[PDB]
Design a protein around this ligand. Structure first.
Ligand SMILES: *[C@@H]1O[C@H](CO)[C@@H](O[C@@H]2O[C@H](CO)[C@@H](O[C@@H]3O[C@H](CO[C@H]4O[C@H](CO)[C@@H](O)[C@H](O)[C@@H]4O)[C@@H](O)[C@H](O)[C@@H]3O)[C@H](O)[C@H]2NC(C)=O)[C@H](O)[C@H]1NC(C)=O
Ligand SMILES: *[C@@H]1O[C@H](CO)[C@@H](O[C@@H]2O[C@H](CO)[C@@H](O[C@@H]3O[C@H](CO)[C@@H](O)[C@H](O)[C@@H]3O)[C@H](O)[C@H]2NC(C)=O)[C@H](O)[C@H]1NC(C)=O
Ligand code: ZN
Ligand code: ZN
Ligand code: ZN
Length: 266
């Protein structure tokens, strides 16, 4: 996700935290954001480009083989140089494990919990963006150049931002708070209300991130690359049809995140 998906994922996520998980996140965050996890959820996307954190480059996504439309961890979860574990699935396990050393305080200074908090949170949102588990050769839709209404863009960016900016301008006067309030609603008393417990049962972290990944490449094959030719124009038909899918994954990411943190801090 771009700024917007992450902010909503995290606001949603923070509102569902138990007492132990709220206390931890407040303490783990710098004063200048007033306890607001959302304020920093983009942080990993900034440092993505610093030589220092070059190593975080591949942890944002998974590249699956073209047209295969499924996710296999040992096949997929690696970087370009075949280095095992380097993919958003790995990172979530990694940063969740790091965070389990917080309460007991048993990692000395090998880890930074604040950074582990922002990576976990951020990457929880990325793994639900269906185009973060897309095809290798086209870079999760990045190198499928298209037009989204009256400006150049690309499929990956349609899902990272366009559908969300578009929805917020057309229906909420650009106010993202409002778009979130409705997304928050559609699973509390709304179309996804009967599904919360179902979103919350995936097993241990490893299984969960595999479930989430799988979900994403299905959505990507069914709704992402379907009905998309390069150079063409995606209109009201693509937007209106996919709006609620994007919205679902914003919610799923958030509910799923609150569950992890709740467990890591409990
Ligand atoms: C764990 O990692 C954390 C993230 O990497 C570390 O926290 C970071 O610590 C650095 C200290 O070097 C902070 O950067 C400083 O920011 C302050 C204040 O920033 C605020 O004010 C400016 C302008 O007034 C504004 O633009 C900012 O947005 C803030 O409102 C500056 O005075 C310094 O020059 C310096 O840049 C980061 O704030 C902080 N990041 C986060 C996410 O907390 C932390 O140090 C690590 N822990 C340990 C023990 O090493
Ligand atoms: C799990 O989280 C930790 C951060 O706590 C990550 O550790 C980092 O791993 C990367 C890549 O494996 C390291 O890059 C290395 O740079 C040094 C040169 O200083 C070199 O010895 C290595 O060949 C490699 O290029 C990075 O330095 C290291 N950082 C820390 C603080 O440990 C780890 O990558 C994470 N793994 C996953 C799958 O999320
Ligand atoms: Zn993102
Ligand atoms: Zn993206
Ligand atoms: Zn990212």
């Amino acid at each position: 996700w771009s700024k917007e998906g992450h902010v909503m994922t995290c606001r949603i996520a923070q509102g569902l935290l138990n007492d132990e998980a709220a206390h931890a996140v407040k303490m783990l965050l710098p004063e200048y954001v007033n306890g607001d996890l959302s304020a920093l959820c983009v942080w990993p996307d900034q440092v993505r480009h610093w030589y220092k954190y070059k190593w975080t480059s591949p942890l944002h996504f998974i590249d699956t083989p073209d047209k295969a439309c499924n996710f296999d961890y040992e096949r997929d979860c690696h970087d370009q140089h075949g280095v095992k574990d380097m993919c958003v699935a790995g990172a979530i396990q990694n940063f969740t494990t790091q965070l389990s050393h917080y309460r007991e305080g048993t990692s000395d200074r090998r880890y930074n919990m604040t950074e582990a908090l922002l990576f976990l949170s951020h990457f929880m949102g990325d793994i639900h963006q269906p185009m973060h588990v897309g095809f290798t050769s086209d870079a999760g839709g990045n190198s499928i150049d298209l037009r989204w209404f009256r400006h150049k863009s690309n499929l990956h960016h349609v899902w990272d931002r366009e559908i969300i900016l578009t929805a917020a301008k057309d229906y909420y006067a650009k106010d993202i708070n409002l778009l979130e309030e409705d997304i928050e609603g559609d699973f509390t008393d709304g179309i996804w209300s009967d599904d919360l417990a179902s979103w919350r049962e995936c097993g241990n972290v490893f299984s969960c991130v595999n479930k989430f990944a799988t979900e994403s490449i299905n959505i990507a094959c069914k709704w992402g690359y379907k009905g998309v030719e390069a150079g063409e124009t995606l209109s009201d038909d693509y937007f209106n049809s996919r709006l609620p899918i994007v919205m679902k994954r914003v919610a799923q990411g958030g509910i799923r995140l609150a569950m992890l943190l709740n467990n890591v801090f409990g």
